[PDB]
Amino acid sequence: MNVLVIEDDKVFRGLLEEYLSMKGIKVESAERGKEAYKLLSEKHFNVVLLDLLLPDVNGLEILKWIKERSPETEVIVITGHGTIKTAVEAMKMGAYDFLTKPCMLEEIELTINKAIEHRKLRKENELLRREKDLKEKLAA
Amino acid sequence: MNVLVIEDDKVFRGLLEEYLSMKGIKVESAERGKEAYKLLSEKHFNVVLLDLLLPDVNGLEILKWIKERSPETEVIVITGHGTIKTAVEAMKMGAYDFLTKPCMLEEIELTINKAIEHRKLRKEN
Numbered sequence: 001m002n003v004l005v006i007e008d009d010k011v012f013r014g015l016l017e018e019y020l021s022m023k024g025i026k027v028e029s030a031e032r033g034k035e036a037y038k039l040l041s042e043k044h045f046n047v048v049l050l051d052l053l054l055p056d057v058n059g060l061e062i063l064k065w066i067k068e069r070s071p072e073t074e075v076i077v078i079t080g081h082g083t084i085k086t087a088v089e090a091m092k093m094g095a096y097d098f099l100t101k102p103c104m105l106e107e108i109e110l111t112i113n114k115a116i117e118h119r120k121l122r123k124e125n126e127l128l129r130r131e132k133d134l135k136e137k138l139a140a
Numbered sequence: 141m142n143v144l145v146i147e148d149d150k151v152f153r154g155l156l157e158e159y160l161s162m163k164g165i166k167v168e169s170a171e172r173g174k175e176a177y178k179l180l181s182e183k184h185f186n187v188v189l190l191d192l193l194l195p196d197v198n199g200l201e202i203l204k205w206i207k208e209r210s211p212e213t214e215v216i217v218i219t220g221h222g223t224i225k226t227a228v229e230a231m232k233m234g235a236y237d238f239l240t241k242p243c244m245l246e247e248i249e250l251t252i253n254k255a256i257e258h259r260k261l262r263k264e265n
């Protein structure tokens with residue numbers, strides 16, 4: 001499993017990489033929106049922790065692109081600069097969850113797993129609609 | 141087009157009835173939980189303006205219900221007791237939007253037009 005962290009707080013970002021690695025997750029981080037767009041345009045990540053407020057671009061912008069491009073990618077927005085409006089917009093754009101700083105590690109872990117579960121059911125169901133609709137539905 | 145208003149405040153509830161009428165809409169209030177639970181078990185409203193904290197029930201629950209029952213009725217939770225977790229939750233359950241009090245009427249209205257528009261590009265799809 002791949003998790004792209006996109007925080008710029010040298011410490012928090014570091015702790016995550018460090019923590020999540022024990023779990024057994026290939027992690028790759030990024031300071032700014034660019035290091036992110038580079039990495040998200042080379043490799044494919046399942047999950048993405050997304051700091052809302054970055055120096056060069058606004059979180060959502062990235063969110064949008066990620067979804068609009070690789071929807072099979074579950075994005076968890078984590079921010080210390082959030083608002084109900086801003087969180088609702090995040091959700092509306094297709095973001096599994098929206099965590100608020102401070103946020104315990106263990107939870108970030110949980111939310112990542114749930115994020116994976118979801119990204120998966122949606123798969124299975126998408127497979128059935130093919131099994132159904134197609135297969136045993138073709139005049140069969 | 142219908143509009144089920146689930147506010148427990150005479151002032152906002154009323155104010156909401158009197159406004160949504162001038163537009164040209166069948167609006168119907170609801171003081172508490174069951175009141176609304178019944179009218180939804182009786183008729184079908186396009187849009188529902190659920191309020192989060194009611195006396196008896198916890199609005200979300202109603203939102204839950206409205207979706208598992210008739211998942212075509214769009215809900216717009218407008219409240220004054222909102223928290224990002226709640227809103228993030230409400231969203232993850234069905235809510236089209238999650239508006240905060242105070243909220244100008246125009247914005248509430250408009251957030252209903254945009255609710256149906258989105259409640260349409262699905263019938264087509």
Ligand SMILES: [Mg+2]
Binds near residue numbers: 008009051053054
């Ligand atoms: Mg920052």
